[PDB]
Design a protein around this ligand. Structure first.
Ligand SMILES: O=S1(=O)NCN(C2CC2)c2ccc(O)cc21
Ligand SMILES: O=S1(=O)NCN(C2CC2)c2ccc(O)cc21
Ligand SMILES: C=C(C)[C@H]1CN[C@H](C(=O)O)[C@H]1CC(=O)O
Ligand SMILES: C=C(C)[C@H]1CN[C@H](C(=O)O)[C@H]1CC(=O)O
Ligand SMILES: [Cl-]
Lengths: 250, 251
């Protein structure tokens, strides 16, 4: 049976291929995650149909605890795998089975060059420079759930005035950083991609809360452990490193 | 009560210091005992710590030894140790997700122009190697990457004289002779904050992590993963590392 892979458009993981003519099926897409999927299917021998998550979301809980996005798709068995920069988190791992990470990342700060800000703490102890994160993304949730002093203070700022310091998506955050006095709390992998292409922007400080992106499977999936094993093979052979270098270099 | 297999390795699991003979879990202290304690709090299990009888981590000859074998044979429920998550291991046990992340780097004396693995690879004057049958040695052994193939060719030559039996042997060898040790970066950080004559050379190669081992099909693997993620998101793993890594302090 051909597997249903849910994913989401996000540079440079999954992008629309630019063509003079209309594209169909998997040929519509290219990106790190498409190369990953190909390396996975070569090792495991599955066929797949890539399909964008219909609600265009990653996966979060609302007030009622109800799930959405690729996570919900997996829970409801509407997809076999989720292949995307889907962050491994406590709340998600409880409702789906993640493979081990294929890429490691951390929360860091995307900001413009030439500033004296050097850490999260610099941001936390002031009010002039605005900062926030993508709403409902795992970065925001980290700050919302943290009981660490500095991060609680940052969450209080972020959630102030009806969450106006938050953005709907990464692209919006990037424009906000470029245009106004704003620092975006963003995953380090995305920061690298952006700073390779926006030479007035830089990462500020190191990584906090190191984690990874994993392939998502519904709980009980026979594919989970096999994809984990394929990932480790790709990692030990140096192919994951090469795959990142391909999409990230500017 | 769960049987936990482990191995003495600073500062993950060490004999606690007392003037009186020690018994049971009270024999041990270290990062992994603190982690075990935290996992047990969240999950609600009792645990019995037992040193792996053959004092090995887990390698294949095609039969397995060490903590991996204990799990395979169901003589332990969990392995809590700096047990590297690897392709060959993951095929025969169920690893939890990593509680600590690391890579392969170089341990070396100070004062040298050596700046990377490539530097070591293109010469033969400075001897270099790794713990025999350890996951680092196996990385170089299985690599098809030119620079690593070359390093493996050197390490394995002359009946593997460039290899060492354990990390402590490696460290002394680095301190005494013109020798560089290929070592997991977390261990390098630990030692280089205690001995100021030693340093790390270059960055990390082959990002990897340590995971709790469970036998294939274990109902505890996912519960432990979930407990680990909570600890990470709460900042506790980070506190636990800082606690055991601080040491005496080096510039
Ligand atoms: O979410 S995870 O699988 N477990 C938590 N940790 C950190 C080390 C404790 C990491 C770290 C890096 C990574 O790619 C994935 C994870
Ligand atoms: O062994 S793993 O779970 N999958 C392979 N990867 C690297 C990202 C590809 C990592 C990276 C860091 C870590 O702590 C654990 C792993
Ligand atoms: C681009 C987005 C909204 C995603 C990607 N990884 C995180 C997730 O999987 O929740 C989000 C980034 C973040 O929250 O900084
Ligand atoms: C200290 C030892 C012998 C262990 C620790 N983790 C690796 C493993 O789990 O195989 C080994 C180190 C290495 O290979 O550099
Ligand atoms: Cl896993």
């Amino acid at each position: 049976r051909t597997l249903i892979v849910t994913t989401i458009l996000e540079e440079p993981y999954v992008m629309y291929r630019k063509s003079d003519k209309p594209l169909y099926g998997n040929d519509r897409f290219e990106g790190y995650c498409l190369d990953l999927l190909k390396e996975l299917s070569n090792i495991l021998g599955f066929l797949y149909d890539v399909k964008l998550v219909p609600d265009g979301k990653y996966g979060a809980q609302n007030d009622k605890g109800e799930w959405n996005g690729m996570v919900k798709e997996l829970i409801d068995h509407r997809a076999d795998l989720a292949v995307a920069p889907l962050t491994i988190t406590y709340v998600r791992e409880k409702v789906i089975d993640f493979s081990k990470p294929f890429m490691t990342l951390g929360i860091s700060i995307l900001y413009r060059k030439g500033t004296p800000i050097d850490s999260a703490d610099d941001l936390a102890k002031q009010t002039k420079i605005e900062y926030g994160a993508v709403r409902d993304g795992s970065t925001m949730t980290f700050f919302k759930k943290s009981k660490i002093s500095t991060y609680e203070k940052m969450w209080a700022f972020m959630s102030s005035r009806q969450q106006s310091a938050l953005v709907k998506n990464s692209d919006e955050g990037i424009q906000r950083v470029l245009t106004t006095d704003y620092a975006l709390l963003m995953e380090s992998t995305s920061i690298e991609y952006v700073t390779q292409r926006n030479c007035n922007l830089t990462q500020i400080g190191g990584l906090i809360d190191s984690k990874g992106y994993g392939v998502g499977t519904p709980i009980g999936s026979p594919y989970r452990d096999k994809i984990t094993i394929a990932i480790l093979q790709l990692q030990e052979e140096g192919k994951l490193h090469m795959m990142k270098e391909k999409w990230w270099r500017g």
